Amino acid sequence: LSRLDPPEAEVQIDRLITGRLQSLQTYVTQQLIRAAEIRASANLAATKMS
Amino acid sequence: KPIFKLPLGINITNFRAILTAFSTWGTSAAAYFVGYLKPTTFMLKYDENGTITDAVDCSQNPLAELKCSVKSFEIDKGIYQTSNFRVVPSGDVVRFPNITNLCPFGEVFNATKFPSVYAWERKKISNCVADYSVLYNSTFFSTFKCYGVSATKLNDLCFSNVYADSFVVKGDDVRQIAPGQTGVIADYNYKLPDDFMGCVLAWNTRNIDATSTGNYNYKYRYLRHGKLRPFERDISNVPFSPDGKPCTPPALNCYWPLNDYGFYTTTGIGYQPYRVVVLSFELLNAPATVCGPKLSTDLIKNQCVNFNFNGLTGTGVLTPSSKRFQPFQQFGRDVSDFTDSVRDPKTSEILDISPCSFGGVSVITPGTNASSEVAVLYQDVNCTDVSTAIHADQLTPAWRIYSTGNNVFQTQAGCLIGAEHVDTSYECDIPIGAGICASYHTV
Amino acid sequence: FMGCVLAWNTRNIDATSTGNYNYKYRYLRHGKLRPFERDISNVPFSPDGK
Amino acid sequence: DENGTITDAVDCSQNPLAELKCSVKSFEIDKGIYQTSNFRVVPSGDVVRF
Amino acid sequence: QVQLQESGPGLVKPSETLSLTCSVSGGSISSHYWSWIRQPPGKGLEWIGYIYYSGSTNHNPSLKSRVTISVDTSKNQFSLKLSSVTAADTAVYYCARGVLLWFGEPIFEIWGQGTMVTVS
Amino acid sequence: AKTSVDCNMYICGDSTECANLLLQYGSFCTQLNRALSGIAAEQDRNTREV
Amino acid sequence: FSLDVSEKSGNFKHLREFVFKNKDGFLYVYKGYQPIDVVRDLPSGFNTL
Amino acid sequence: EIVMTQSPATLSVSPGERATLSCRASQSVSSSLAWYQQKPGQAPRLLIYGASTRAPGIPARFSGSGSGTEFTLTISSLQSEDFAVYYCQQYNNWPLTFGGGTKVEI
Ligand SMILES: *[C@@H]1O[C@H](CO[C@@H]2O[C@@H](C)[C@@H](O)[C@@H](O)[C@@H]2O)[C@@H](O[C@@H]2O[C@H](CO)[C@@H](O[C@@H]3O[C@H](CO[C@H]4O[C@H](CO)[C@@H](O)[C@H](O[C@H]5O[C@H](CO)[C@@H](O)[C@H](O)[C@@H]5O)[C@@H]4O[C@H]4O[C@H](CO)[C@@H](O)[C@H](O)[C@@H]4O)[C@@H](O)[C@H](O[C@H]4O[C@H](CO)[C@@H](O)[C@H](O[C@H]5O[C@H](CO)[C@@H](O)[C@H](O)[C@@H]5O)[C@@H]4O)[C@@H]3O)[C@H](O)[C@H]2NC(C)=O)[C@H](O)[C@H]1NC(C)=O
Ligand SMILES: *[C@@H]1O[C@H](CO)[C@@H](O[C@@H]2O[C@H](CO)[C@@H](O)[C@H](O)[C@H]2NC(C)=O)[C@H](O)[C@H]1NC(C)=O
Ligand SMILES: *[C@@H]1O[C@H](CO)[C@@H](O[C@@H]2O[C@H](CO)[C@@H](O)[C@H](O)[C@H]2NC(C)=O)[C@H](O)[C@H]1NC(C)=O
Ligand SMILES: *[C@@H]1O[C@H](CO)[C@@H](O)[C@H](O)[C@H]1NC(C)=O
Ligand SMILES: *[C@@H]1O[C@H](CO)[C@@H](O)[C@H](O)[C@H]1NC(C)=O
């Protein structure tokens, strides 16, 4: 942004936005995968407690 | 309804109402009003006949934001997260070093004679300030090429050194002075690296560099057992034989590896001599010597401000630090390549950088039918900063109407505005965090 | 913008050897026009704004 | 070091254990089997058969 | 920083020679132009000439014969002498460093304290 | 862990020029925040159940 | 500055280290220093130029 | 050869109101005029070197403008310390010429 004019900057900005969107998507997806296998253990724990 | 769409094409700043009056002159009872419009987000409800019957205005207190966000006219219970919040910066800091000499670039550009391309000369320029805006909007130059940086912005940058390289080029071979070119000049006479950063200039000189009889003072090396590496030079003149063994002319296959040349005044456009200058900008992370003209300011510690220490820009909270830089280090970096601290150019103080406060805001409400009361939770912030930013309208989003009353309370998850603390315990209705619980209850 | 732009050369009737001097353009103003605005005011101008 | 001074290095190509330390970003490894990189064979000659 | 300081005689008889010297401290003669200027009393400035490193020298397009200028890298000094001196030549004389930006002539950025000289 | 993320600082940070480009993708990270907030609420439910 | 010349009967008391590199027409020089008292050996150690 | 003139020959002003001086030249130049200040019994100083560029350390209130044959120096918020004579010089051509100057009278 400091050493390039906006018509030149936006071409790279599109690329950086694409990459970072993709990496957030991957993180959140795997986070939903993990949540389920922890939930099943919490349910077994509550069963053993009861 | 829309009566007219009129193509007048003028700008209107003021207006006058026209009245009527009658017989001596007298007046009759009449009243009228005025108001102004603001650019705002509205929600509209259409009836089955296609007619509007209601609206809400999203910026008129937080509950309007809750209704706008959920696309409803009724909300039932709970805590809802609508949008971020942040603080707007309040000022500007500019902190270039102090330099008092003027760059003598004319000692290179206005030189009476240039060198032969095979042995180009390099000169260093430092500890001076000058403007580039002259050569940008001037027509004297036949071509302007800049890499890595746009020529419009050269006046906002500081460089540790400039190196100027100068030589004469023949005709259209100006095309060869670029990264990745190939040919007799691009491989034997001169060579530019892959990651070049600078600007290339050229202008036509037939007036003094050529004549009808011709000038024969220039040479170029077309024969060599190997191409040069970036910015190499070889000024050796010896007999050459393709076998790679010494010999002496006029014996068999003995030559001179560089060719004498001359220009003519009647050369065509592809042939006249040109002068070329290459400027290479050294962005070394050390104290800068050459800078563009800017006025500086004092520092403004402990406040959210724009800062421009030395070609680096952002917003943050400046504070003193306990870093210990080595005499050859001017910047510090964290993981993810973020700048973390800087050496003040004027006094060599060491200053930290940190971001202006940010976070999420969420709205607590009882049922809309029961009441229109709300409480606002600002997550993970000390109330002092948000109160000192609500006042004097430094926060955003900015409600048109709201107030922080005397009810302010601090929690580990952040602090609540508009909720009254109670020294009694009950069962939870809405959990907030860290043990703090909320409910809607009699005073 | 949405439309088409056209132009053609008119040296035959719009120019002459002595010159035609019937046209004018405004190079000084305290502020740039907004889209499709017009200003046909002719007055003395001083950079002080008085 | 905390004062900004280098105190140690490792060289990743000087025996496999250097590759294990370089890969895990550590100076200590505790047990087990760790997969670091592929392997392959470089070709030894050329055949042309027009 | 640099300091220019100059010295010379105060009075010159008619049809005689005047000469001045100006000298540097804090730095040394290397890559900049050096210039002699005079101001007649109550009147606008005049440029007599400038010389730079490696001896190359420039003078007024008139009075070409009225002066020659010399520079010595040794002892950080330069000097001029006037072929003839008359009453009307009285002025304050200045030595100054000229810096060249891009093209044309140099801007005189650092000025010597100057001295007043006359004829009688 | 019950971690949370802010879309605009990570993807676009300080700049406004990039936010006017991220606008072209619409609601996406907002349903992302909706998801990651659901995971956060679930962790609290798991502990209260056990 | 001022540099002496003298001869000493005793064993070497100084160890001086350098590095030289060439890239892009620039030559890079580094330096260090370490006091040592050894005879005809390059002593094991770590030092940062 | 460029010849130079400056107008008017004299001005006077009271504290707190701006004034402007103008110098004119016989043929076109571009961004080649410098502004000099002189005080009684002292050497000149450089205020503006570019067409409209403050020399380093010149107070922020000084400014100027011009192109072609017309240029003007604007002095704003004048203080008694600003009492001086002012000159404009052009370096575009080989011969060097300074203007006749203007006396500003208290
Ligand atoms: C930065 O670089 C610039 C550019 O220089 C470039 O590089 C050099 C190597 C050459 O290639 C240049 O051509 C090139 O531009 C440099 O500027 C040069 O400085 C030179 C001196 O250092 C300077 O040389 C002098 O030029 C004088 C001519 O000046 C032109 O303009 C003035 C206007 O004031 C006029 O004199 C004249 O034009 C006007 O008047 C004419 C009639 O009088 C008429 O044509 C018009 O009315 C017009 O208005 C003159 O025209 C010249 O400029 C034209 C562009 O406008 C060109 O077509 C062409 O060049 C034309 O000639 C000369 O008078 C002066 O000659 C005097 O000294 C000579 C050497 O001593 C001598 O031969 C002469 O004759 C007698 O004089 C002596 C007595 O003492 C003895 O020598 C002898 O007895 C002789 O009989 C003259 O006295 C001299 O050649 C050169 O012109 C400029 N370049 C320009 C202005 O473009 C900068 O200096 C450099 N920086 C630094 C710090 O040095
Ligand atoms: C708008 O819709 C309303 C009902 O949603 C319409 O009201 C009824 O229209 C019928 C048409 O035959 C009448 O017989 C009823 O008497 C109306 N009920 C009322 C007025 O309470 C209404 O007509 C619609 N608007 C228009 C312009 O037709
Ligand atoms: C490098 O860090 C070390 C400790 O991590 C510093 O050592 C101590 O510094 C304090 C400074 O007040 C002294 O009082 C202690 O005596 C030091 N402890 C020692 C030497 O064992 C050390 O000072 C730092 N380096 C520099 C150059 O300050
Ligand atoms: C800048 O000026 C300040 C005070 O005027 C001074 O302390 C400092 O030394 C100057 N900068 C340099 C690089 O000397
Ligand atoms: C070039 O452009 C700048 C833009 O600010 C302008 O001020 C200047 O007068 C122009 N011409 C020059 C530098 O010759």
Author numbering:
A (entry chain A): 963 to 1012
B (entry chain C): 217 to 239, 244 to 663
C (entry chain B): 416 to 465
D (entry chain A): 267 to 316
E (entry chain G): 1 to 120
F (entry chain A): 714 to 763
G (entry chain A): 168 to 216
H (entry chain F): 1 to 106
Paper text:
The coronavirus trimeric spike (S) glycoprotein, located on the viral envelope, is the key mediator of viral entry into host cells.
Upon incubation with 47D11, only the closed conformation of the SARS-CoV spike was observed, with stoichiometric binding of 47D11 to each RBD. Similar to SARS2-S, the RBDs of the 47D11-bound SARS-S are also less compact than the reported apo fully closed structure. The 47D11-bound RBDs may be able to adopt a semi-open conformation, too transient to be visualized by cryo-EM, which could accommodate both 47D11 and ACE2 binding. Alternatively, it is possible that 47D11 binding results in destabilization of the spike trimer leading to the separation of the protomers and exposure of the ACE2 binding site, as reported for CR3022 (55). The protein/glycan epitope is located on the core domain of the SARS-S and SARS2-S RBD.
